[PDB]
Design a protein around this ligand. Structure first.
Ligand SMILES: [Cl-]
Ligand SMILES: [Cl-]
Ligand code: NI
Ligand code: NI
Ligand code: NI
Ligand code: NI
Ligand code: NI
Ligand code: NI
Ligand code: NI
Ligand code: NI
Lengths: 132, 132, 132, 132
């Protein structure tokens, strides 16, 4: 409606990995993709602060052998019964596990639970995904 | 390492709600905020680059009456058995569903299926969380 | 403590299939296995009539294509939200599905729900399994 | 078809609670009751006969603190990846778990794993529901 240009300083290695992925997706340029990022952020954020009701999936990959991650995960999960519905676990290989934990409840409490889990030791990856 | 600098054209109201949320969270500059978003975008999409062997969860939400969405999904999924391992399904309310589909395979073929799924009359959007 | 012998009439084809399986398990004879059956029955039964609290797994295999079984299953499941926790579904092949539905609640209501489901059209197999 | 007749030695108190429950349910004779139990036993175990390719759910219940039960399970399961597909896990209370493990493979190897699982310090019993 009325465009304003500004500049940003970013480590070159990083900006290039971006350009590669973005180039792949079909984007015409950066401003375009960065705005998406920005636009999505704002939205994902108002929910996170929302403090309402969300249903979510916490996907995580972890080497069950590195530390007591397997221990911690359960203890942490059993600590939040009301918010944790059930959990799917797929043994990816001799050492690695993929586990998606379904959670329902107050976005605030859930976004803080997702954090606790993903903040764990053996946790390699992980991401929360919410719904209205 | 080399710190490259560049600028982007962005609509005001958009750039407004951003800075606006930026303060709240506690950033120092837009460059910090924006860089993160980028590091995160890379994390989320690097798999779409190349053809490495991936594995993860495809979370979606739907209405099991609103169309053939249900049969469609099964017919579709059952088409790519090899890539789709299992899938958890929570019933949110009387008509709306939450279903996490776990998969593993080659990025190109994975995104091929991810797209075909997300794009169906009945599928009301659905995020992806894939690693390698 | 004080053994009483009685006799039973049973289709020969049947008694032989029994003898085969029982022979396989490691049983020394029939009375032995039949008593197990009887002993288990009595126990599984007092729960079923129990009317208390149980957590259960309803495993079922069905050709999603034969009838609207896929339809019926969801409609029936969404009809019992409070009792149905979540559901795992594994696409066994182009036509067949294995789906284990987790349920919690009043044994009476749950044992009657398990029935409704397994009584469905496309339903080939199925069995309820309860816990204290 | 030929109706064979045979008799069995059974302890009274046992044969007592049986007939006792038989009336309730509404049977006409013990022979009806007993025959069913047998038809059902066959349904539940025919897979243990031979080596056909089976698939189903191994439902179990445990206490995630009571021993190494948890790590044990994972180490064990991760040993037979090929046969074990996925597994749903509900948290019942503060220390007790419910976990349905979905598998597919050859009867002999399936029962081999089923046994090794059911028999572990931490596993407080667990039923099997397998077909072909
Ligand atoms: Cl930074
Ligand atoms: Cl009969
Ligand atoms: Ni614990
Ligand atoms: Ni595992
Ligand atoms: Ni089909
Ligand atoms: Ni549903
Ligand atoms: Ni419906
Ligand atoms: Ni299926
Ligand atoms: Ni291990
Ligand atoms: Ni648990």
């Amino acid at each position: 409606m009325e465009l304003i240009r500004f500049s940003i300083s970013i480590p070159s290695k990083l900006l290039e990995k971006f350009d590669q992925i973005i180039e792949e997706i079909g984007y015409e340029n950066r401003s375009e993709a960065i705005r998406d990022l920005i636009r999505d952020f704002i939205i994902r954020h108002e929910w996170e602060v929302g403090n309402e009701e969300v249903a979510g999936t916490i996907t995580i990959v972890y080497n069950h052998d590195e530390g007591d991650v397997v221990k911690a995960l359960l203890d942490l999960q059993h600590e939040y019964l009301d918010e944790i519905i059930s959990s799917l676990h797929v043994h990816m290989d001799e050492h690695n596990c993929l586990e998606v934990i379904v959670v329902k409840g107050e976005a605030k409490k859930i976004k803080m639970i997702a954090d606790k889990l993903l903040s764990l030791k053996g946790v390699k990856h992980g991401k929360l995904v919410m719904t209205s």
